Amino acid sequence: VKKFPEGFLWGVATASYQIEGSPLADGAGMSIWHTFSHTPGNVKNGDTGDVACDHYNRWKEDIEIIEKLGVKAYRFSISWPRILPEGTGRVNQKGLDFYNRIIDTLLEKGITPFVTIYHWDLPFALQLKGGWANREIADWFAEYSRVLFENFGDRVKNWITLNEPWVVAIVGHLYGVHAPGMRDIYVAFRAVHNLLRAHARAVKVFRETVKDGKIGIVFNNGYFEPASEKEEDIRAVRFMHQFNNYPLFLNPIYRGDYPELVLEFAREYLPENYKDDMSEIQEKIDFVGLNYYSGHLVKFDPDAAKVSFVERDLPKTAMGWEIVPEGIYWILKKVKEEYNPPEVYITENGAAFDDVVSEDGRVHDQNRIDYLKAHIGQAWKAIQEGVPLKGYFVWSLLDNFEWAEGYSKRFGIVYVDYSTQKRIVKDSGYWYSNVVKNNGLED
Ligand SMILES: OC[C@H]1N/C(=N\O)[C@H](O)[C@@H](O)[C@@H]1O
Ligand SMILES: [Ca+2]
Ligand SMILES: [Ca+2]
Secondary structure, X not given: OEEOOOOOEEEEEOOHHHHOOOOOXXXXXXXXXXXXHOOOOOOHHHOOOOOOOOHHHHHHHHHHHHHHHOOOEEEEEOOHHHHOOOOOOOOOHHHHHHHXXXXXXXXXXXXXXXXXXXXXXXXXXXXXOOHHHOOOHHHHHHHHHHXXXXXXXXXXXXXXXXXXXXXXXXXXXXXXXXXXXXXXXXXXXXXXXXXXXXXXXXXXXXXXXXXXXXXXXXXXXXXXXXXXXXXXXXXXXXXXXXXXXXXXXXXXXXXXXXXXXXXXXXXXXXXXXXXXXXXXXXXXXXEXXXXXXXXXXXXXXXXXXXXXXXXXXXXXXXXXOEOOOHHHHHHXXXXXXXXXXXXXXXXXXXXXXXOOOOOOOOOOOHHHHHHHHHHHHHHHHHHHOOOOEEEEEEEOOEOOOOHHHHHHOOOOOEEEEOOOOEXXXXXXXXXXXXXXXXXXXXX
């Protein structure tokens, strides 16, 4: 048996664009995901968030499923352009109303809300003004955040500024695979820097507006292992960890500069006097959220950021991602070793598999159970070794719009039949309910 600490938080997570649908309802402005997904070629099958899980209408029934499963924390995001259709200026009361109903219902049911302020659905109106490339986004994001704090901070006490700023910056502005779909390395590093500035401004106003609250920030992480003992491969691993994982943002937040290998690689792409902003970027945070899915074997490659991945014969998910549960232990140990944050959450962990509804009307996803069990066990090991891990959130409550992969990839512990919008709790859902009941793993 592996019992967690008594106050441990077990949650499920979603994001607004992935589940809500009705992106233009009730006065909402377009987001960059609306325009990106409506551009032919950008998303598999031409899928969009126009309907998704229809959570905009079905939110009450989905919360009843959270209650049914016995889960006591729900991490969800707020759509910026539902709240401020033009990004700044006009506040849309019906956008506030939508989230107020969710928040009030969660509290009535004793489910703790964790609110992600930004999970990639930037207002299109702000992208026309450069989006994350524009230094002024620190002001725009501070404005938006203040609206949320003033409206919701009486009830919501646990907040996240940004989901995965690395992905926002690099995947959105260097690889061009996510909205706003750009390929410019100078823009991408200015986005990294503005994301830190925006985050820090939001925390600063949080201290004025939610004096009894806690605020943090969420990073994607992978477990990188070297293909050989060659110094060049060891160094390539170090680079991937400093660039792709939490240090890109936590070295600034905790130490006041970007990590060594990031500076070596990218100093020419950063704003000239970027260091002027580092004093503000050090604004104190209450917790760090780490997302974790997969591991990669890495090699130096002069033809590649000089790093290529080496495919391994390891079990994989429907995303093609290698299943390496020890990486969740490694990343937790490493965050403590490097930055010693006072509190850490696993803010996403999960897996996509090819789910089907059998004749019994059930969804038998033993592969998803095995995945979640292995990673939860490794998280438990990290706790035994002193990592201040305070909670774990499964990605996701619901099958949903998987960004550029569209609806083809199912990460839910609840299946969604998109023709009828019927929800079917998967075996992993029943499994996880039992994990919450036992406060850990029982065999
Ligand atoms: O790719 C799965 C999941 N993983 C994520 N980050 O690693 C995103 O936050 C989330 O929106 C996405 O659906
Ligand atoms: Ca109920
Ligand atoms: Ca300064």
